[PDB]
Amino acid sequence: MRLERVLEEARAKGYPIEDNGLGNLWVVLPRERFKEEMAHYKAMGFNFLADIVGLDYLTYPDPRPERFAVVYELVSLPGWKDGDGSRFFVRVYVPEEDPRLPTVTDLWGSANFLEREVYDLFGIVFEGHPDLRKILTPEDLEGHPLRKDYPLGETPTLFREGRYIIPAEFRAALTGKDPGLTFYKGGSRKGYRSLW
Amino acid sequence: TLKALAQSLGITLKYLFSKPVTVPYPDAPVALKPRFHGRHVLTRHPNGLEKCIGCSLCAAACPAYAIYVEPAENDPENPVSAGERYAKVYEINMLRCIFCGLCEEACPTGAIVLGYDFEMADYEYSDLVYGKEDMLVDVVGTKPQRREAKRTGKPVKVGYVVPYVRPELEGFKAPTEGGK
Amino acid sequence: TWSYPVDPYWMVALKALLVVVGLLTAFAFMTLIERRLLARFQVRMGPNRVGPFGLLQPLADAIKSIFKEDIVVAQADRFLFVLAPLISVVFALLAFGLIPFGPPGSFFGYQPWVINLDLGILYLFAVSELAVYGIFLSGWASGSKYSLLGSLRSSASLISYELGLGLALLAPVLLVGSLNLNDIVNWQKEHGWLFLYAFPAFLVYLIASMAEAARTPFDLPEAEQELVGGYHTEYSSIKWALFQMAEYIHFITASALIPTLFLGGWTMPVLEVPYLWMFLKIAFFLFFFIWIRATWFRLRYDQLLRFGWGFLFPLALLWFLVTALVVALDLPRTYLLYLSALSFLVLLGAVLY
Amino acid sequence: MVRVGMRAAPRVSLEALKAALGGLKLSEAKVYLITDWQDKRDQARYALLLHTGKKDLLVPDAFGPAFPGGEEALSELVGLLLAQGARRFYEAVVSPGEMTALLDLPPEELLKRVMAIANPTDPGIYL
Amino acid sequence: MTLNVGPQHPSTHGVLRLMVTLSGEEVLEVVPHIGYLHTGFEKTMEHRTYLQNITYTPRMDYLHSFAHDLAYALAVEKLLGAVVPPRAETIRVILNELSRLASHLVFLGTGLLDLGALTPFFYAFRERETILDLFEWVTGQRFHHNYIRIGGVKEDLPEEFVPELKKLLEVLPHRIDEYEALFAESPIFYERARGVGVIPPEVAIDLGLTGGSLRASGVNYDVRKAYPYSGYETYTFDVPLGERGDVFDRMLVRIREMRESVKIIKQALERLEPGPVRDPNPQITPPPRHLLETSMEAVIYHFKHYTEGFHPPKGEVYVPTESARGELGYYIVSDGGSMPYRVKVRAPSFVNLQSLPYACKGEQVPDMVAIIASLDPVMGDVDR
Amino acid sequence: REGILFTTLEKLVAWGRSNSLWPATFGLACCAIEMMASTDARNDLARFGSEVFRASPRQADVMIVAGRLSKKMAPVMRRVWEQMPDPKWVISMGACASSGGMFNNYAIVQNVDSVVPVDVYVPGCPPRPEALIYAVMQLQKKVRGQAYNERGERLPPVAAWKRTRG
């Protein structure tokens, strides 16, 4: 029941409401109103903070508002006190040269680890965090891996007598910016969706 | 709940008198399923011609990229493959290989098919690149197994048994459940 | 030693040498048999390997243990590191002579035992303290406080139940009035199987012997699964082997003393064979104990201490008071049979609620 | 970032590296021995990238048993780096054709790539 | 005593480093250090075709992996509109609940062994061994099986699979009842676990503890009930619950989970009628192996599908599922290309670990091991 | 003294060390559960002499690299190897450890022969428990001096004996 009131609240304030025909909802809040709005969201009855997923759109084919984007997931468990089951996402873009974000650790302690990961994997420093310390990657690791300008850092495959492979030169699969092996890719290799 | 200690003791004793459950490899042949992921085999047609047409569809779909295929053009007098193309060099780095079945799944001629050997433990990285003539269906045993049988003079016995070999393994000779 | 003769000193040295090397072979093959019996318990089967029945595997184990780069870890005490295993082994080997394996001369002529001191149980108690000594000293010497705390756990718990051992061993002394094991065993020959009179105290003795690293506190601890234990984790080739050896010798000596003192040390009412009945009772207790080894959890040494201190020892001293009343007034001895039978019926029937 | 030493001259590379090293303390530095073909060290050729954090140093492919005195020069080199207190050792595996162009890429790209692809190594394999 | 209960030592299964800030035999607070298995799925998966990634998916949670395979599969099916045949769906729920039984077996065996007794590790493992054979029957692999596909499953069930499954399903209920008879009327475990492991549902909710450890504290929150995905809407189901969150209630609730999962295996087994095996859409499914010698479209589609792959439309998607450790999901960003733009995994064992300093606070030092075994981490899932 | 310098004693001590191989588990990933399964009551490496399992490194000779070796764990495991008595052997288990495996990136050591001296390599994902038995038998005959490679050479009994530690 509360998701409908979330939509009525955000649409009334002019925040874009993103929706795919698959049943998952995105709500993009600006940087300023982010902290206070999501505090109100927790107050709205959102027990559970599932995910903090950081995104780097540097090499995305279509342009996007900002390079980095952090998405939180707010949920209210159905089997708890008064559970509607309302689950939704909050996306907040973070500039390329301004990797800031206030934490919701004070509201949910789950953002203790999760935000650290996004600070570990991406250059995004989370404001108000108790401890922003590298979680996963080695302590001496320099950089933030999951951003596209950061190498995957592969090693060749090895064979008998000088015969080797460089997989990035071996891949027949295409990314989004890869034009393809012919002059171009159109039709079903530019995106295909069956109509049930 | 003092009774639980006694109940635990009693059931452990009942299992004590229950002797059997175990299988003693290598003395007892390991029971494998016919679909098991083992050492790759290259299969050949009835004509004797090899099935591999050297098309590198196995190598591209490999998530580790462990398969190497140099092609060449058949010699009409004594051809090796069925078409105009065969596999001069076929290497698979078992230290890269993760045993998917993607090379089996993508092979259009049914040449490359996983076998059943798991006894391929060796000492050296450089030696664990199993080649074409190291995987043919005609061969019976793994690299360390064949080297041990040669430096030992004693024939090869594979330590596994299966209910039957698949039709995709036409020619794969192996011990089948005890039929022999 | 009112009535018992004395062999020459060279026979004492020879028989001690025999007991030491027999304890070597015994603990090796008992490690094998415990492995296989655990296997039978947990379905899996044992090593039908190097043996057949495993009986050359202790040789492989001993040969591996030597040549294993016996290392003196730096940042460790040069002296105690080396000295503690020797303590743990020496004060484990001895205290096995007193256990009578037959009437005098039943060693094919001379003496079943080694020494038959007037005050035996005190000798056992004294040398039993010294095992905990080697444990915690080795813990200190290693220079790793992770093993220090384990040594402290060992010493605290073992010392609590070690105090309880005295309240356990009091009860039969009031009856017999002698501190030599042969007189006690002969008393058990006359009236029969001392635990029949003192089953409760017998219990608190048995359970007390479980606290000495045998199993089920299992918070000695060993380095595994918990705050790592002491007297290991820094010894490589032989000193660790010496710790394992001495601890297992203590295990089998205790499992042999339990029938010797309370039950029928060999001295069977019928068929009166010198050695075989003692060995069979040793094996009986060993097999029940291995059942326990497989079948039960740890105790965490907090409940273990509370149980020993508040539960075992007041109960044992209560039984001591009852038995001391009976002996001082000496009216029957049968009343103790009746009371121990009633006590066992209580401590048993209270289970199946 | 400096480039000292020369290809296929192990002894000259070693002497120039002796001089250019000086009394530089390597307590927090990183040594990347870049090569091709992981397994076969008997015929290996080696480059070195020294990442101090405050300035970086390059040595082209001049060490290893593939060159006369590259095995003894690489042994001396690892002994020299270890004397100065190095603890963090890495090895990078590149395609042979990369090894040449990797010394001509800008410092940020070359160094980022090397740090991403590095394998912790036991120096005993080079001593 | 800030003690270094190091990675993998002493017997911290699932390599994990602990700085136990702790004086005495109590527990003040445990500071964890993870990442000692960081291998790079979220990054490597950005350079592998959707078809390939099914080889990367099971190996994250190597115990209950088909949940990973199913989550990835379902998310991509929704993203490109794939159709589940009824038989494929039934088979997928079979493999899901069976891998759940296997993961549960390993969890309780590890918990018992981690502090306490060694014996009951084997018996449960015995059954697990049998289960593996079933998998080896259909997938040819013990675990890490690459069987699932976007449309459905790779190929059909062998003739010999179902009778073996019936055998194991008939022997299991007595076996699970035996484990519960041994453990529930706990002799010492009662005095070991009923008190320990303080789990206030409020903070368990606040820290992101979904993995079956929360319903042991009395919260009825399961994705199979909250968000039916693979036909769980159509099952008669008992949903385990706990009175008060401790280690004891956790273990008992998971045992009842195993029995309910066996019941679901049987239920799905009965309703199974022959039919198709995967989504026949050629853009999404490679041509059948038999008409590779008749049709040109067959050869072109096989070549393309097995070199390039397929291109789903541009968009982001995410769907949650319930594994033996709770809510799981893949956030898939696709840019219309043959390789996914990004895959972010909600690792239940990753956040379920935030409750380590809390739960074992004031508990025993040894019980810091039993409370970790009871937390059921899979450091392939955490580190990732 | 290294178990050498007597025509009988070197055979004897090689016998002893080879059969009494006492593994030191370093459970890392999904390879390690296939290492655990090699001890259950269907296919147990509990026969050749590996019944007991010394978790402490001061007491065990065989270290099995069982799983993907993430770089943040490389040095620790290194010292775990250095915290072993000198007569020690190391088997490299799996594809992730032997080579880089399928994870060819910044997070994984692409061959664990880098950090530790490997005795035996055993491919598979994970290598079947029975392949692990075959590898421990390979190492068994290797340390007796009963091992030859493809190139015709007999291999030394103990690898990690030929490395200038530092």
Ligand SMILES: COc1oc([C@H]2C/C(=C/C(C)=C/c3ccc([N+](=O)[O-])cc3)CO2)c(C)c(=O)c1C
């Ligand atoms: C525990 O579960 C798990 O472990 C591991 C690692 C640690 C490990 C330890 C021990 C102690 C094995 C062991 C078991 C039995 C014996 N034994 O002698 O019987 C000896 C040793 C083996 O793999 C991993 C990675 C894991 O992710 C899970 C869930």
Ligand code: SF4
């Ligand atoms: S089974 Fe998989 S990893 Fe092995 S060669 Fe085939 S496609 Fe590659």
Ligand code: SF4
């Ligand atoms: S094995 Fe099969 S897929 Fe690989 S090149 Fe040969 S014919 Fe093609």
Ligand code: SF4
């Ligand atoms: S080789 Fe396979 S089973 Fe072994 S650690 Fe790697 S992914 Fe896991």
